[PDB]
Amino acid sequence: SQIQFTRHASDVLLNLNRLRSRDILTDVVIVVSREQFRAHKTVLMACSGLFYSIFTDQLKRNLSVINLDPEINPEGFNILLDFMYTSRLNLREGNIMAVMATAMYLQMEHVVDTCRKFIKAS
Amino acid sequence: SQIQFTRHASDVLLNLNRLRSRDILTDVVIVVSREQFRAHKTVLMACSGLFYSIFTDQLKRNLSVINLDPEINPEGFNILLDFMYTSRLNLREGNIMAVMATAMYLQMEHVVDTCRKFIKASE
Amino acid sequence: IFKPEELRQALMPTLEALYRQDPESLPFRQPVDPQLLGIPDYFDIVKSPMDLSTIKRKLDTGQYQEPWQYVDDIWLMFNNAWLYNRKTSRVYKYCSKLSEVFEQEIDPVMQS
Amino acid sequence: KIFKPEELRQALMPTLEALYRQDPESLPFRQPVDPQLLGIPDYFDIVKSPMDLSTIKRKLDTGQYQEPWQYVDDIWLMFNNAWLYNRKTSRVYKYCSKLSEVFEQEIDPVMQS
């Protein structure tokens, strides 16, 4: 019955990326060691088990700043943040292990799974 | 040559709908005559020229409440809000004219265009 | 022989009396959506779903031949909820209260 | 003449690096123009041969320039794309003007040698 707009989801994602790129209505900064990343909490929650857990927790939901585990690699977070806003995952042999480790911590399981496929077919 | 996750965008949209449904991290109420609709401002901006303009305006970006034109039909808004969060547009002969009017006001042009196609093909 | 309109006139107030209960009817007014609600096991536990809206349709389309068939769907609906939801949960508690209300005013109607 | 990769790289790269050093002016120039992210879909209709600092840097480091005039052509293509595409009132056009000043100051010396 309802009409299906097959490009609508991509268009929303693109526009969300645009707002990120222009720092419009970002409501959190994610600190990964010394690096910092401005993002939208809802997009984070929508792509990550961990962010889902953090922002669902009432004692954290209204934080403006979230410090990740210091073990966490910034380049890895950054690749994944970009993935969250694009559907495009930049996997290279030089980054794969840091990307997967970061995905495992962020609870991005289909990413983690894709990483393992990349590793084994390497 | 990045890896392309073809279901990722829909998955994000679905999850955004889930948060809407549970009233998680909604930051605005859209008042359409007497009725009220909680939403996320970013999703609204992302789907609507008007909401884009409202929330990019510095004098309005931080408003928690937006009153639409009293002319605007609630059932029509609601159908479109649900479209924004689902990719699914519920067009019926009984609603089509109010849906299109609402889409024209919200500046959702591929919707408005689809509405015109629905009208013309209705026999 | 029960004609649609007879049952509809007899039974629809009992249905409408459930809807009138707020908030308790709210988990029950629409079919359970496992996807939106984020409970993917639902259709494994609950093999025959039922809700107020599906019952209302069946009345209005005169799909009940006898009142016991209406009463069966009402209990399927309540029983699905009691089965699926934890006893601590709000929707289970709402199920209990809603069931009270149904009993209160089906017993009269069923006598005729 | 015999211009070696390392020759050109050593001669020209300071001129490139001198552009990057300019801040904020180099910022619209450091990465290829992204029409989609930036929300300017006509870009690739106006600008049929894109160029930016990063693409030029690659070409140097990959020794894709045989002669310094080829490097200087890409730099001017880059500036010219910006002057073409951006309006004269706009910040990126104004940045283009400033950045081009700096390039001219840097390259005139180097091109004699």
Numbering used by the authors:
A (entry chain A): 7 to 128
B (entry chain C): 7 to 129
C (entry chain B): 1048 to 1159
D (entry chain D): 1047 to 1159
Paper lines:
A catalytic KAT domain (86% identity between p300/CBP), an acetyl-lysine-binding bromodomain (97% identity), and several other conserved protein-interaction domains facilitate these functions. Here, we developed lysine acetyltransferase TCIPs (KAT-TCIPs) that redirect p300/CBP to BCL6. KAT-TCIPs recruit the acetyltransferases p300/CBP to the master transcriptional repressor BCL6 to activate cell death in DLBCL cells.
To understand the determinants of specific ternary complex formation, we solved the crystal structure of a BCL6-MNN-02–155-p300 ternary complex. This KAT-TCIP features a 4-carbon alkyl linker and induces potent activation of the BCL6-target reporter gene and cell death with an IC50 comparable to TCIP3. The asymmetric unit, resolved to a minimum Bragg spacing of 2.1 Å, contained a BCL6BTB homodimer and two copies of a p300BD molecule, each tethered to BCL6 by MNN-02–155. A hydrogen bond connects the carbonyl of p300G1085 and the amide nitrogen in the MNN-02–155 linker. Five residues engaged in fortuitous interactions constitute a p300-BCL6 neo-interface: p300L1082 contacts BCL6S27, while p300Q1083 contacts BCL6R24 and BCL6R20. The interactions are primarily hydrophobic in character. The computationally predicted linker length of MNN-02–155 (6.6 Å) deviated by less than 1 Å from the measured distance between p300BD and BCL6BTB in the co-crystal structure (6.1 Å), validating this approach. The crystal structure of a KAT-TCIP in complex with p300 and BCL6 exhibited potency enhancement by fortuitous amino acid contacts independent of plasticity at the protein-protein interface.
